Design a binder for this molecule. Structure first.
Ligand SMILES: Nc1ncnc2c1ncn2[C@@H]1O[C@H](COP(=O)(O)OP(=O)(O)O)[C@@H](O)[C@H]1O
Ligand SMILES: [Mg+2]
Lengths: 87, 580, 107, 98, 93, 95, 86, 107, 93
DNA sequence: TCAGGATGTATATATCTGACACGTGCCTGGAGACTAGGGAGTAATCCCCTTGGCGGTTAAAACGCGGGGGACAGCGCGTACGTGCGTTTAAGCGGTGCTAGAGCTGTCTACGACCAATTGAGCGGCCTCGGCACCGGGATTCTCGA
DNA sequence: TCGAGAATCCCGGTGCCGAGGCCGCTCAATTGGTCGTAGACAGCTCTAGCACCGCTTAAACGCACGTACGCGCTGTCCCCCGCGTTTTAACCGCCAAGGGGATTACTCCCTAGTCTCCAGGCACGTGTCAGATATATACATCCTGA
């Protein structure tokens, strides 16, 4: 029946239509097609996959289970994405 | 013997309340007693205990200090409070302003009672978005009000409102939600400035962790703030059995009851109305099953012996297995509910033993849940057994909460088992028509007892109330059961403190208190499938024995596989050994 | 024999001693020079004063006494070469400076 | 007879309102569940600090804004004011990622 | 327990450039990470720069060519002027 | 004769098939010496240095024409223009 | 010893040679304005790389530029070259 | 007391002693481990054998006994992940692998 | 006078992979610069990796996370296997 | 569908050539022995993150729904380089001389490194207060149509 | 070619909370006093970069057609925009316990220096073999044509 968690809105759709809409509006774009949504969700999942891979690599190296801010700052700063304000 | 030092502390700090606008002597220092009720009170008469307690709180207003009503649910804190507001509004002529704070679920009750019993007192409510709230906001900004309703969230949302106005006499409700010390709402009421005098109200006294502290022993009383800061551990060291809790610290307990005399007021319902005919408080004992057998401990082995297992593993897989539904595809790849899928759990065996008998004997049973996965699976097999029922949850939105009760209370209805959670309803559910309660897992606090048990025992149920508390053999949720039950029976001093917090007969706090200290001295003494016994625990009388033994003869001829599902072996061990 | 910090001898703000030590223990080279931490102190003086000064100009333009990471955003990306240094690196809370394409906007 | 705006004016008003403001755009909790769900794949039962999730959030937000800006330039180069999948994958194809 | 930051140094620079202008906490942290990152570029590049010459010590000339080679544009000229000025003023003490 | 566009394929296959250096040495030599004369006078370049810088600028510039080709074929115009060849280094982050 | 002055020291890259250079990149149809722009971008790239190279050669106190200096200039430039050392 | 190179103890080719020394004097850390130069020796074994093996396959495909930087070019850019490592970095004398766009070529 | 190169090591790898296949001088130099560059990546990144943990020494785990974090893809798995195999074989001697 | 057209395949030979096998000197890896310090372990204290639930409040998000305009094939027309083709011609190459400076070796100090006393400088807590944030309400301001 | 209407900025009034001073602590900076040692000059080698100088020849170039195609122009719808209305879940707060990061502090153990003799690799020479320029050959393949 409905007891199974298999039937539910999947997590990647958690980014909504007006969310990514606004997020492109900041980019300076006017008219947006319909597949920009799915394609951009794919891109976001790939990028987050890479950065979180590096992050869990650092945190796993220190033997800690806690992913900290300095971790992500090291992943981005190593990828060329260096991020100020935190590290 | 720090109560004399506390008499000095109240000698120095006593003039804060009145000036800034025998230990009873400090509260007896002014001599007046008035038993008479307010004359403008309309809609009925006050009960004898209502007149006594009302005269007690007004007697506190004579000395003007703060007060506490700790008494049991069902004794009418409402009419006592609003009667204090109309009496204090009438005779004493201080007349206001008054601030009341109640949960939104009870705001309809309080608002409905303030009309009948106090027509002359003008009130204000807050609901229906800032559009409808802004009108009465403009109404209150002018300073026109007497008794103003509000809820907890509108304290922080109306922080501007309450900040722009100075109150006089506040009386709040639901003190056991407010109790939290680090609670943002409590800090905002510390930055609230103040009114003159405050009244805490709670249906149940301190529960769970160590004695009062955060609520009444800090937040309620002015002297108690600065005084009891350090002493919390000094008086909390009691909680190494006879030599501590009994020998020396018995008088320490006597002082804990000696300091709370002018403060708390608590009375048992059985001492006044006592309309409850009786109750039955028992338990049962279950045992494990296929996944709940050593495979359970085997999971504890390969996994330990994500994280936080010992707390998480219980409420999931000692109630029903494959609530993760990941291993459900292993045991039952057909993703289809068939016979003996729901019987792989050890606890459920007892259930599907009772359900045919309650279906034959025609009794409507209350059931309380946690881990709503159990509600989903139990609901699906509950559809497999083909018996009617009604659901409820925290997602109900209150539409089915209000409308559903009219479908439940119908006598001609065939709904038997009634689905509930432990936290749901906020004690406003008002179900008097079910005589039986069963609970899968034991809550961490007595609110299981004083909520789930007060659903039945409340007025309107004249039958015998039967309770079945499930537990499994050789498990840690055992030591959670005796931990919460036995280790949280420390409040037994307080539930005893209701009887001598009442009119307090002389022998109550020594002779009868000791008669309870029997139950204090049998603690360790209580630490130490049968179809006939489990059949008879639900039997009220002999003509029920006739029909249940008739069922015994009904299933005596027919064979009723095995008891439950068993570890055929390739499913059991191969489950969790490939995960890690 | 009075103790005088050599950071004040060069008339600077950023400390010479701290950058000298931290540079040593930073295992950049097995031996360190004398005037090198002074020279780094100087270039950090000029960079911090530069970008922070542009931030002061942006905050003054926005009629705000304090400075916001938005003001550091405008400070960075307003200047050409300063953006050329920080172009590859991102930032936090700054945002994007307003821009609209020529033919994208209507008449 | 109601009143409305011509198509394309609301776009300018929006873009000005967002580019004018520094506030974080995508909503926190859904991104939280996204990071936890995607990190569950690599190693089990990780624990993220709040500043870590805010970090990764603001980072992916800024980079993705840059991606939509690049896609906008490629679109206006294509003479189509509408952005498609073709040019948004051409942005990260020309960047050297794909 | 002890977490070191440049902080009050950037504060003093702010007070000698724009006295009335203040700085927030986020701005102090972001510019702290700024000077840390730039320092890491200059020193980290001067390390390998002195390693290519088989020179065991890092000196003022190494940092000189490091900052001259690091940040492009006219911005380097003023850094060279202020740097050499501070070195000469330091040695003349 | 040949139809227009076949010679293009034959060329592209002939070049991409071969590894030989393309631009001629000596003009590039005079280019590097002339452009280095601006910074510092009377520099001396080793042969391997000029070959280095040559092959480097050659490879990078080939990559630039490949990206310009992708941008052009995206624009639906098979012809490359100044617009897309400056859009390649504008989108790369250089300009 | 002497200095031979021959004109066309900037655009001396010939359109057949640079055209072949584009043909390796896989381009189909080449315009007429690609050549000047390509000489511009090549000139700027050459600016940067030779600026770094002569920075190294100047730091070492040598009057001769070596291939290793170019490999380091390209190194920090973001593209490492192989086969010439380092 | 017979001298045995520890590079042969691990059954490797790249020397452990040379990478150990060069790693020490390379001022990467103030103290160095024991099995670290062995581990680097191993990963260099696998990388060199990998890419050089692909180069051998390309040279065998071209019917050439020796290997040319063209063969290393094809070796690199034929493999996916190996190109992902070397994508950002350029090369010398390798060239470009043959490619032609779909709709660019005629019918 | 003395210019070191890996050389005959790459030669031995060639002879244990493709015995009949030869290598030119340009190929030996370009793959020499290859292993030099890759080594510079791994060790150079393991340095700062051990510096972020405030660990003064570089060890086998530092190079482990260094090579695992450096080169993406399935290519890292075989490097980890061969690496740990060589370390265990070295210590078991 | 077929003939003669301007480009790439395989087959002997030969032919410089530079990779590789073979053989010396020599600078650096390596084992053995002897001294010091870096990190892993156990163990209380306090702060932050988990994993299952509750009660509320709104701003955002979703679903229609008309409807405006831009993507999107087609259609012509005028350039615009593509493709030979004689005609110059400057790059490649081989072929000397001339010497600037990269590189190596040898001494000799100015200089960091390390260590012992000495102490202001920078960082945490405590406390206080302007500056940014929020709220009606009201004076333009560009945009939607006559 | 012009006039109303929703948006936007200008206004004070609260209002509350990080930013800044202020006080006190403690520990890295600072100041000498040896002391071993890169590197700074100083001189000598030689070798590779820089001059023509002449010959040889693919390479580039101005110029002639001649179709390829890029751009402007034009209907045709289909997709996204801007409202307008439900609806619903993020956002707080609350609860129940539990466990994971830190900071001193003895305690070992693994790799820095460290002096000693011994063998692996490379710069330098012989002395032989894979490949590219050099020749001649049906086939792979495309344009004109039908
Ligand atoms: N003196 C009284 N006369 C009539 N009804 C009363 C009186 N006191 C209490 N009640 C009943 O009690 C109900 C309210 O009880 P309530 O105040 O909710 O109990 P509690 O104080 O335990 O929360 C009312 O519906 C009312 O009918
Ligand atoms: Mg009541």
């Amino acid at each position: 029946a409905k007891r199974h968690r298999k039937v539910l809105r999947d997590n990647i759709q958690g980014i909504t239509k007006p969310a990514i809409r606004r997020l492109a509006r900041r980019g300076g774009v006017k008219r947006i097609s319909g597949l920009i949504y799915e394609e951009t969700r794919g891109v976001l999942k790939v990028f987050l996959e890479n950065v979180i891979r590096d992050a869990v690599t650092y945190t796993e190296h220190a033997k800690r289970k806690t992913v900290t801010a300095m971790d992500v700052v090291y992943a981005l700063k190593r990828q060329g994405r260096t991020l100020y304000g935190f590290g | 013997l720090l109560d004399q030092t506390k008499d000095t502390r109240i000698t120095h700090l006593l003039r804060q309340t009145n000036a800034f606008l025998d230990y009873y002597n400090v509260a007896h220092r002014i001599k007046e007693d008035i038993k008479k009720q307010p004359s403008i009170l309309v809609g009925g008469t006050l009960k004898d205990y209502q007149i006594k307690g009302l005269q007690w709180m007004v007697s506190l207003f004579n000395n003007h200090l703060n007060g506490i009503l700790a008494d049991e649910m069902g004794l009418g804190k409402t009419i006592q409070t609003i009667s204090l507001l109309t009496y204090l509004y009438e005779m004493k002529n201080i007349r206001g302003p008054y601030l009341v704070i109640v949960p939104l679920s009870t705001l309809s009750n309080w608002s409905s009672e303030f009309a009948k019993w106090a027509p002359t007192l003008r009130t204000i409510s807050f609901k229906g978005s800032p559009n409808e709230r802004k009108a009465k906001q403009a109404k209150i900004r002018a300073g026109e009000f007497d008794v103003v309703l509000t809820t907890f969230e509108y304290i922080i949302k109306e922080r501007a409102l309450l900040s722009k106005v100075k109150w006089v006499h506040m009386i709040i409700d639901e003190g056991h939600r407010m109790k939290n010390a680090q609670s943002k709402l409590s800090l905002t009421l510390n930055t609230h400035y103040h009114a003159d005098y405050r009244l805490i109200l709670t249906g149940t006294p301190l529960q769970n962790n160590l004695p009062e502290l955060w609520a009444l022993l800090n937040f309620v009383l002015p002297k108690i703030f600065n005084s009891v800061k350090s002493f919390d551990e000094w008086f909390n060291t009691p909680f190494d059995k006879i030599e501590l809790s009994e020998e020396e610290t018995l008088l320490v307990i006597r002082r804990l009851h000696k300091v709370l005399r002018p403060f708390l007021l608590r009375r048992l319902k059985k001492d006044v109305e006592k309309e409850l005919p009786d109750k039955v408080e028992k338990v049962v004992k279950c045992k494990m099953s296929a996944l709940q057998q050593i495979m359970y401990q085997q999971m504890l082995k390969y996994r330990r012996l994500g994280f936080n297992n010992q707390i998480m593993q219980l409420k999931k897989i000692c109630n029903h297995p494959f609530v993760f539904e990941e291993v459900e595809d292993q045991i039952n790849p057909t993703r289809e509910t068939n016979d003996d899928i729901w019987r792989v759990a050890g606890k459920f065996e007892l259930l599907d033993r009772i359900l045919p008998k309650l279906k034959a004997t025609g009794h409507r049973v209350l059931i309380f849940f946690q881990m709503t996965q159990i509600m989903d699976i139990m609901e699906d097999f509950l559809r497999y057994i083909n018996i009617k029922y009604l659901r409820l949850d925290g997602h109900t939105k209150s539409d089915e909460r209000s409308e559903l009760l009219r479908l439940f209370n119908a006598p001609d209805s065939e709904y038997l088992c009634f689905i509930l959670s432990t936290r749901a309803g906020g004690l406003g559910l008002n179900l008097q028509t079910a005589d039986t309660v069963i609970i899968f897992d034991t809550d961490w606090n007595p609110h299981q007892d004083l909520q789930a048990q007060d659903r039945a025992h409340r007025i309107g149920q004249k039958n015998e109330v039967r309770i079945l508390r499930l537990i499994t053999t050789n498990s840690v949720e055992e030591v959670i059961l005796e931990r919460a039950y036995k280790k949280l029976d420390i409040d037994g001093k307080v539930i005893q403190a209701g009887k001598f917090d009442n009119k307090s007969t002389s022998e109550e706090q020594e002779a009868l208190l000791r008669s309870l200290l029997d139950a204090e001295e049998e603690r360790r003494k209580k630490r130490e499938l049968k179809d006939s016994e489990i059949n008879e625990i639900l039997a009220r009388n002999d003509e029920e024995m006739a029909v249940l033994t008739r069922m015994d003869e009904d299933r005596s001829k027919k064979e009723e596989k095995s008891r439950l599902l068993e570890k055929k072996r390739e499913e059991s061990e191969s489950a969790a050994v490939y995960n890690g | 024999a009075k103790a005088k910090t050599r950071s004040s001898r060069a008339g600077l703000q950023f400390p010479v001693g701290r950058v000298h030590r931290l540079l040593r223990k930073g295992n950049y080279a097995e031996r360190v020079g004398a005037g090198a931490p002074v020279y780094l102190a100087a270039v950090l003086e000029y960079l911090t004063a530069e970008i922070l000064e542009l931030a002061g100009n942006a905050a003054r333009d926005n009629k705000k006494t304090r400075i916001i990471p938005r003001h550091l955003q405008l400070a960075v990306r307003n200047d050409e070469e300063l953006n050329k240094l920080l172009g590859r690196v991102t930032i936090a809370q700054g945002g994007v400076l307003p821009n609209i394409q020529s033919v994208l906007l209507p008449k | 007879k109601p009143h409305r705006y011509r198509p394309g004016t609301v776009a300018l008003r929006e873009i000005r309102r967002y580019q004018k403001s520094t506030e974080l755009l995508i909503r926190k909790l859904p991104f939280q569940r996204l990071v936890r769900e995607i990190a569950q794949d690599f190693k089990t039962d990780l624990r993220f600090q709040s500043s870590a999730v805010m970090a990764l959030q603001e980072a992916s937000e800024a980079y993705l804004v840059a991606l939509f800006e690049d896609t906008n330039l490629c679109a206006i180069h294509a003479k189509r004011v509408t952005i498609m999948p073709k040019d948004i994958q051409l942005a990260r194809r020309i960047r050297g990622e794909r | 327990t002890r977490k070191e930051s440049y902080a009050i140094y950037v504060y003093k620079v702010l007070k000698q450039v724009h006295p009335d202008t203040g700085i927030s906490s986020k701005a102090m942290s972001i510019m702290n990470s700024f000077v840390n990152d730039v320092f890491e570029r200059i020193a980290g590049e001067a390390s390998r720069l002195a390693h290519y010459n088989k020179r065991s010590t890092i000196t003022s000339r190494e940092i000189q060519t490091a900052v001259r080679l690091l940040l492009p544009g006219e911005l380097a000229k003023h850094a060279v002027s202020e740097g050499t000025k501070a070195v000469t003023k330091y040695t003349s003490a």
